[PDB]
Symmetry: C5
Subunit: 117 residues, 5 copies
Amino acid sequence: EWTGDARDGMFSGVVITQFHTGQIDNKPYFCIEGKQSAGSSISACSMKNSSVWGASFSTLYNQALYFYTTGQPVRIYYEPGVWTYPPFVKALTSNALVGLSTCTTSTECFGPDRKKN
Amino acid sequence: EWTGDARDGMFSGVVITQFHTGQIDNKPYFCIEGKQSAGSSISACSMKNSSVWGASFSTLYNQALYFYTTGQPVRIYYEPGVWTYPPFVKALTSNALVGLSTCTTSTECFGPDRKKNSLE
Amino acid sequence: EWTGDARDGMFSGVVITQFHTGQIDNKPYFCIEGKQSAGSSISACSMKNSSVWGASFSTLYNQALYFYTTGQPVRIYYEPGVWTYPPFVKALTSNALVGLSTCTTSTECFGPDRKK
Amino acid sequence: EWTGDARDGMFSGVVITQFHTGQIDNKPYFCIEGKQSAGSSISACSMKNSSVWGASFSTLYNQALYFYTTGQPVRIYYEPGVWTYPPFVKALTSNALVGLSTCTTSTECFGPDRKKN
Amino acid sequence: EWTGDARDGMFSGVVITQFHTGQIDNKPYFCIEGKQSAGSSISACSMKNSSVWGASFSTLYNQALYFYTTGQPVRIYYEPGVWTYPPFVKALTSNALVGLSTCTTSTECFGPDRKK
Ligand SMILES: O=C(CO)N[C@H]1[C@H]([C@H](O)[C@H](O)CO)O[C@@](O)(C(=O)O)C[C@@H]1O
Ligand SMILES: O=C(CO)N[C@H]1[C@H]([C@H](O)[C@H](O)CO)O[C@@](O)(C(=O)O)C[C@@H]1O
Ligand SMILES: O=C(CO)N[C@H]1[C@H]([C@H](O)[C@H](O)CO)O[C@@](O)(C(=O)O)C[C@@H]1O
Ligand SMILES: O=C(CO)N[C@H]1[C@H]([C@H](O)[C@H](O)CO)O[C@@](O)(C(=O)O)C[C@@H]1O
Ligand SMILES: O=C(CO)N[C@H]1[C@H]([C@H](O)[C@H](O)CO)O[C@@](O)(C(=O)O)C[C@@H]1O
């Protein structure tokens, strides 16, 4: 697996506006929310030691909190349908956070595309 | 367990005003105090490798110190009665810190509620 | 053991003015010095993986550097007579750093008392 | 191996302008891009626990994020042809980030040279 | 071994002006350079998992970058002759970075002397 696999999905030019940290089944996690210029929203969580994407927890937490601080538009890479506990999904999201990138415009960001072919 | 379990409890729109760090029984811990809009205090502690919320010590420590620094109003998620050692509970609190969120208002915050259901 | 044990000691309303990091016996350590408004001085060191207080090294280092940075008055919790290598005691202190707290006044600070 | 080995290569006086963070094969990696002025581009990635240069991940992550933040001109030490997963190389680079230095001019920087004879 | 052992050496009132980070033989290292007002110069490296001073790499890294950022005059504790690989010594230095202190003056700084 790779952040840049040809899959859903990515949102570009988002400002990270909300941040949550919790624990579930002995695993710390965090979630972010961001809006695009046009008002469109994306949420994604990263959980320590959980899923394929568990290895990225610390790096993503650090980078997410950095970008939440600067408030610069970034690209959120995510994978839908990873989290399955229904209370969790309802309150938050099923989307795993799978990478992050700075952006030069609202559509053009540094790094791979993550789109279904 | 889960931060968002329908249990006590949460305090929304809290400003983290006080920060303490210590050690008990070979385990580092930190405690925070925050104020709500009307002047009431909340306190909650996280302890490394403790009972059920110990796995979140590092994340919570970093996030709480971060929010202390910004002075942002935030949601404190806690579980009452976790710490049982009387001198500790007396000086500090029995509350474990189990989560944190940013808030859009003094009352509306990102993430799950941590709240007991009502009886209809 | 506990930071809040009824033991020596604590200094409240201290601004951390000095900071030192080094190594002894394959362990990193740090020391801080601070003065109260009253000019009364306090030094205390934390050592990584040390006997009793070593589990706290990482949190205390983080918090102490943080407090050194803001310049805010804080409570220094300490245990005297912990470090014993004589050249180390002589140059620095025997005091272990055992906790830290923010303060509201020169005497009132968040957290427990540490006093006999 | 050593950052300052006489091989390809280094780019001096680079301002880091782009930052990307992702995961591949159970490993977090970050990737940076900078401009010399000059005006030409260098990208390099570091990856946690990667084979040769993985020991340096956490140090380089910190240091690169630091330098991205200050915007100061820095030396990027790189090793070409390290990353080999072709879609990764295509979207990003094959270059491993193997060192960083502060610079006094566009060309003069602290530390070893990394260049072939 | 100790930062405060009666050996070479230390330079007081040094502003850390240059910073380098790299890897050699599967170990990360960083090096700093600084000048002390009269313009006398000092270089020192810390390397993770080296036989003697390796334990303090990440603490010294953190502290030195912190001091590079504030630009305050500090004390550099070093031990000469630690790095032996000749191209490394030629490009950088043989000096191990052994400790760091805040300073109150260009000559007086917090902590032990490291003096032969
Ligand atoms: O189709 C999806 C599903 O995640 N995402 C696309 C994404 C979304 O359709 C769009 O951002 C929603 O507003 O648009 C992109 O232009 C982008 O934001 O980078 C490309 C991206 O593939
Ligand atoms: O009743 C409790 C027990 O913790 N908590 C409630 C809590 C407290 O009653 C209140 O914060 C204390 O004044 O009020 C809430 O409006 C909130 O702050 O989110 C709802 C929350 O469920
Ligand atoms: O006597 C000692 C020895 O540490 N400490 C006391 C301490 C010192 O006497 C005082 O701070 C020294 O100036 O005064 C306290 O009011 C405080 O600073 O919190 C109470 C504390 O027990
Ligand atoms: O030839 C290469 C291949 O990395 N790089 C050289 C590099 C390139 O010629 C230059 O950066 C243009 O890409 O110039 C240097 O002056 C430098 O930037 O330090 C020396 C460096 O060895
Ligand atoms: O002899 C050495 C070898 O490092 N260093 C001395 C050192 C150097 O001679 C001096 O810093 C070089 O300008 O001067 C000191 O005043 C100091 O800077 O603390 C004392 C120190 O022991």
